[PDB]
Amino acid sequence: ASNFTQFVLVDNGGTGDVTVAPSNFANGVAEWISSNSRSQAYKVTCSVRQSSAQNRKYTIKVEVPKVATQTVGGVELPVAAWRSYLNMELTIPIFATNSDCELIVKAMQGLLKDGNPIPSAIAANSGIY
Amino acid sequence: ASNFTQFVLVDNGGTGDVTVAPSNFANGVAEWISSNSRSQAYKVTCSVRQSSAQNRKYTIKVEVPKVATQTVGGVELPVAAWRSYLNMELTIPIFATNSDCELIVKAMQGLLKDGNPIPSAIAANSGIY
Amino acid sequence: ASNFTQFVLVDNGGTGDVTVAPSNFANGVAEWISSNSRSQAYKVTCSVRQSSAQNRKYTIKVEVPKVATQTVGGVELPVAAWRSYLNMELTIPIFATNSDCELIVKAMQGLLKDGNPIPSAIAANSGIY
Amino acid sequence: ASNFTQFVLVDNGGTGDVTVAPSNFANGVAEWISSNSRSQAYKVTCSVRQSSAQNRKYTIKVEVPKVATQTVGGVELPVAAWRSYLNMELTIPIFATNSDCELIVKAMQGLLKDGNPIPSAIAANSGIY
Amino acid sequence: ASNFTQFVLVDNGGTGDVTVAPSNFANGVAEWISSNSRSQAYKVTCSVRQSSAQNRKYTIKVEVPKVATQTVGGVELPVAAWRSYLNMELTIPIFATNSDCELIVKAMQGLLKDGNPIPSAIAANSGIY
Amino acid sequence: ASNFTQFVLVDNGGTGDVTVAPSNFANGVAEWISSNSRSQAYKVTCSVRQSSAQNRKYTIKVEVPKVATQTVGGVELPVAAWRSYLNMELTIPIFATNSDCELIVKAMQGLLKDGNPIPSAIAANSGIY
RNA sequence: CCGGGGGAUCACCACGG
RNA sequence: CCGGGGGAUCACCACGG
RNA sequence: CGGGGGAUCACCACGG
């Protein structure tokens, strides 16, 4: 098949859903963007490299924009008031089997499950305590 | 409310679940670990700081053990061959409201939802194609 | 046990209460922040140190914001029109027992009790007369 | 009308109350002192000034003594074994209305309310934890 | 839960018991002190660090004071005639499981059990022979 | 009386107890070890000296083997991965009476009593939180 | 290339290795 | 950072790596 | 360490 497909980044229950689609693979960096002007789009990038002799490194990036309409020179333009940036690096040893890797994915999913500590703190503009 | 509580990191459907619990709070850095030797434990740390004048920044770290052919409670060397490391840094502009932050969390959840490109690639020991 | 938890900074009956929650505790400085936009949040910090041979010194800071919306270029952001800054330093000799400290706290509470000179002047943009 | 009057600094039920009375108001600095030996008295001072173009600044000071008798050469005098010194500075922009100031006072009162982190730590010779 | 709780350091059978409580966690050093003036208090501190790549180090400190009342400048002050200092470092490899660690705790407890060699010598102001 | 006798280091309720016995007295340093190869033994050494004019100092050392997955009588390398080291230094001012010293011992016993913070943390492969 | 609860305007930058 | 049956007024100091 | 020294508030300059 091919895993370079579009997926929904922000699930808002069928309405207001932010879906992101493949837009580039130049230089080994897979890119996805929302159906917007490049200045207001959601961006997701991913890449893998054999960082060392004995392990691989996945580098993922996500950009969440705060869309706005700005007036520059008396003209209105679609812009982003600001952006939130997520940068993550995952280092996996070459000795990890597929089951070993599913474990990693499940842990990451559990980490952000609704109601858990971390996602709770982030959504409330607070720390852990 | 007080979010520093134990939670399920790896959900294996009730049986075989991996729970992670509070183990340290030195220097504001919250830590959680599973019931294992520190060399084979699942570790999670989180912390927030004001990186700059306009940004707040969360640093989240997760360590996952290689389980295939593992010897529980044994000395496994080299350490690098038996562990995966996840480094996450989330930058959020100071103008983000709680709602904005909820959306950011949703985006993170969507990025790793089962069946999506990234988690599928990682779990299959592969890249994008 | 822990006193690094959330508390009510401004008691407005039981609804419009301003609550402040732990956010960061790095380098011996505990920091509390109210929810939502960090740009419009109340901030409280506290620290203790041995200022000298016989003295222990507390440094407390509080920031009260004037919530407002800033529109520029048609782009509006949540900001603080201005902030009120309170900085206080309390020195207590190492000979002070717990009873001595309870008294010091009572004095601070009395100084600001409703109806007394100091709080009355501040609440009215006035000085002493 | 006058707010330069005596008030209760330490409320000990209704008997061992520490009352502080006007003593001097020279050079824009109001001073209150408790009765009896000046050497063992509680002291409170307050002043306001225009720290800058947009800011008005309050400077408040409080001294809590540790009453004791000093014998030297067979001659005993009433003195203060030591003193606890509180110095606070409050800055309020000239745009603050009376309501804004009432709020600032509420915040100060809340910060020191019985049971909250700060007063609890001080009353126990402790810091934050 | 939280293990940062108060505990009794010196058990004297319900009467004359020296109990110690949490008082600080600044800079990752957990501190406990007895309910005394800071100049006469019992002190207990603890901290963990990943000393090397393959092991952790616990650093514990205990201070036992000999309380006295000293007359400085004709005034009486609560002081400590002298202090006994206990400094201990415990290095545990990361490969140690929880059971491996309970073993360490039991050994330390056995080492100081009433009647055993070491505690006997210490309490008699003598060496081993 | 002559305290250099064997004793129970690890009390496992009669069955599975670890006894440690006198094995060396070279240079005034008393040593005790369990019945194992020196690479897997429980070791205890103790010594007293006058560190300075006003202080006497006890140096106590304890070595505990990692037991999980251990191979009795086998060659286990690296040595650092299979052993925990405890270093204790107790400083007692020359004015301490036998009674004073008994209290010091009690404090040490209390610090490590079952259920208290420190032993609980160590046994759970964790820190304070 | 590796490191940091280093920074960013975010596939970039500085520092230390 | 590591070491000492190095020292302390005890989260510090000196020395050797 | 000082100031009824200032701030955009754990920063800044002047004083020892």
Ordered domains of chain A (ranges, CATH): 1-129 (3.30.380.10)
Give yes or no for F68 touching B (CB within 8 A).
Answer: yes
**Which 3 state secondary structure label does DSSP give C4?**
coil
Whether residues E37 and C4 touch (CB distance < 8 A) is answered with no
Q: Helix or strand or coil: residue C83?
A: strand
Contact assessment for residue A36 and residue A42, using Cβ atoms and an 8 Å cutoff: yes
Contact present, B19 and B11 (Cβ < 8 Å): no
Could you give the C-alpha distances from D87 to A12, D63, D110, in angstroms and in order? 52, 9, 18
Which run of H or E residues covers position B44? strand B43-49
Alpha-carbon separation of residue E22 from C87, D40, F107 (angstroms): 26, 33, 16
C22 CA: distance to closest CA in chain B (Å): 9
Q: Residues 2..61 of D with a Cβ closer than 8 Å to E: which?
A: none
Give the bases of strand H that a protein CB approaches within 7 Å. 1-11
Cβ within 7 Å of nucleic strand I, residues: C 29, 45-47, 51-52, 57, 59-61, 63, 83, 85, 87; D 29, 45-47, 49, 51-52, 54-55, 57, 59-61, 87, 89, 91
Cβ neighbours, 10 Å, residue C117: 22
Strand-pair category, E55-72 with E75-93: antiparallel
* Omega before F119 within 30 of 0, i.e. cis: no
Helices in chain C by DSSP H: which ranges?
A: 98-111, 117-122
Output the distance from A52 CA to G3 C1' rounded to whole Å. 15
Rounded to 5 degrees, what angle do the CA atoms E87, E90, E91 make? 145
**CA-to-C1' distance for F91 and H8, Å?**
10
Alpha carbon B38 to chain centroid, angstroms: 16
CA–C1' gap, D87 and I16, in angstroms: 21
Tokens for A1?
A: 């098949």
Which strands make up the sheet holding A18-24, listed edge to edge?
A7-10, A18-24, A30-34, A43-49, A55-72, A75-93, B83-93, B55-65, B43-49, B30-33, B18-24, B7-10
As ranges, strand G nucleotides with an atom below 7 A of a protein CB are 1-11
Q: CA of F92 and C1' of I2: distance in angstroms?
A: 41
| Distance of alpha carbon B18 from alpha carbon D95, whole angstroms | 56
The resolution in Å comes to: 2.8
Q: Which residue of D has its CA nearest to C12?
A: D106
The first and second tokens of residue D86, run together, are 């509180």
Tokens of C85: 């800054």
Q: How many CB atoms lie under 10 A from the CB of residue B53?
A: 6
* Most distant pair of Cα atoms in chain D: their distance: 60
The region, left, alpha or beta by phi > 0 then psi within -120 to 50, assigned to residue E9 is alpha
> A62, A44 in Cβ contact below 8 A?
yes
Strands E7-10 and B83-93: unpaired
Tokens of B81: 């061959």
Asked if B112 contacts B119 with a C-beta cutoff of 8 angstroms, the reply is yes
Residues 6+ apart with CB under 8 A from F16: none
Peptide bond into A119 cis (omega under 30): no
CA distance A66 to A60: 20
HSE (side-chain half, CA atoms, 13 Å) at C63? 20
Interchain proximity C24–B97, CB inside 8 Å: no
Task: Confirm if C36 and D70 have CB atoms less than 8 A apart.
Answer: no
Check residue D129 and report its DSSP letter. -
| Count of Cβ atoms closer than 10 Å to residue F48 Cβ | 21
Q: Long-range contact list for B57-60, CB < 8 A, 24+ apart?
A: B57/B89, B57/B90, B57/B91, B57/B92, B58/A122, B58/B88, B58/B89, B58/B90, B58/B92, B59/B87, B59/B88, B59/B89, B60/A111, B60/A118, B60/B86, B60/B87, B60/B88, B60/B89, B60/B90
Sign, CA dihedral B99-B105-B109-B112, equals: positive
**What is residue B72's DSSP assignment?**
T
Beta carbons of B91 and A84 less than 8 angstroms apart:
yes
Residue in this structure with the two tokens 């209105």, named with its chain if needed: A76
Measured distance CA(D47)–CA(B68) in Å, rounded: 72
Q: Which residues pair with A72 in a beta bridge?
A: A75
B101 membership: H or E segment, kind and range: helix B98-111
Q: In what order do the strands lie in the sheet containing F83-93?
A: E7-10, E18-24, E30-34, E43-49, E55-72, E75-93, F83-93, F55-65, F43-49, F30-33, F18-24, F7-10
Measured in degrees and rounded to the nearest 5, phi and psi for residue B100 equal: -55, -45
Burial of F76 (0-12, 13-18, 19+ CB in 10 A): middle
Count the helices and strands in chain D (H runs, E runs). Answer: 2, 6
Beta strands in chain E (DSSP E): 7-10, 18-24, 30-34, 43-49, 55-72, 75-93
Footprint of strand H on the protein (CB under 7 A): E 27, 29, 43, 45-47, 51-52, 57, 59-61, 63, 83, 85, 87, 91; F 29, 45-47, 49, 51-52, 54-55, 57, 59-61, 87, 89, 91
Measured between alpha carbons, how far is B84 from A99 in angstroms, rounded to an integer? Answer: 13
Identify the chains in contact with A, defined as 3+ C-beta pairs within 8 A: B, C
Q: Do F80 and E54 touch (CB under 8 A)?
A: yes
Opening angle at CA D93, ends D92 and D96, nearest 5:
90
* Beta bridge pairs of residue B23: none
Q: Is the CB of A55 under 7 A from strand G?
A: no
Per-residue tokens: A112:
């952000």
Range A74-90 burial, b when 16+ CB lie within 10 A, else e: eeeeebbbbebbbebeb
Q: Rounded to 5 degrees, what angle do the CA atoms D80, C58, D60 make?
A: 70
Question: CA-CA distance, A43 to E123, in Å (whole number)?
Answer: 70
Q: What is the amino acid identity at position F29?
A: V
- Report which residue type is found at D14: G
- Residue from C58, C9, C4, C69 nearest C31 by CA: C4
Which among F36, F35, F38, F56 has a CA at the least distance from the CA of F47?
Answer: F56
Neighbours of B28 (CB within 10 A): 24
Based on the number of CB atoms within 10 Å of its own CB, is F14 exposed (0-12), middle (13-18) or buried (19 or more)? exposed
Residue B45: CB less than 7 A from any atom in strand G: yes
Strand B7-10 with B43-49, pairing: unpaired
Chain F's closest residue to E29, CA to CA, is F128
Of the candidates A116, D121, E27, A127, the one whose C-alpha atom is nearest the C-alpha of residue C20 is: A127
Say which nucleotide is closest to residue D31, CA to C1' distance.
Answer: I4
Chain F positions in Cβ-Cβ contact with residue B25 (cut-off 8 Å)? 127-129
What letter does residue A114 receive in the DSSP assignment?
A: T
Which residue, among B86, B89, B95, B98, would best test binding to A if mutated, counting the most A CBs under 10 Å from its CB? B86
Cβ–Cβ under 8 Å, residues A71 and C73: yes
* Chain C contact probe: residue of E32, E34, E39, E63 with most C CBs at under 10 A: E39
Strands B30-33 and B7-10 turn out to be: unpaired
Q: Given C24, C35, C39, which is nearest B49 (Cβ)?
A: C24
User: Distance (Å, rounded) from C-alpha E61 to C-alpha B50?
Assistant: 33
* Residue that is written with structure tokens 């009572």 in the block: C106
C112 token code pair? 């600001």
CA of C84 to C1' of I11 (A): 16
CA dihedral B11, B16, B17, B19 (to 10 degrees): -160
CA–CA gap between residue B115 and residue B106 (Å, rounded): 16
Backbone angles phi, psi at C92, to 5 degrees: -130, 120
The residue of chain E with its CA nearest to that of C53 is E39
With vertex at residue E121, the alpha carbon angle to CA E116 and CA E122, rounded to the nearest 5 degrees, is 105
CB distance C35 to B101 below 8 Å: no
CA-nearest of C120, C128, C118, C123 to C64 is C123
Residue F74 CB-density burial (10 A; 0-12 exposed, 13-18 middle, 19+ buried)? exposed
Report which secondary-structure segment, H or E, holds B118: helix B117-123
B118, B47, B44: which is closest to B89 by C-alpha? B47
Distances (CA, A) of A66 to A38, C129, E48: 13, 51, 42
Q: Is there a contact between E7 and D114 (Cβ–Cβ < 8 Å)?
A: no
Reduce the DSSP state of residue D111 to 3 states and report it. helix
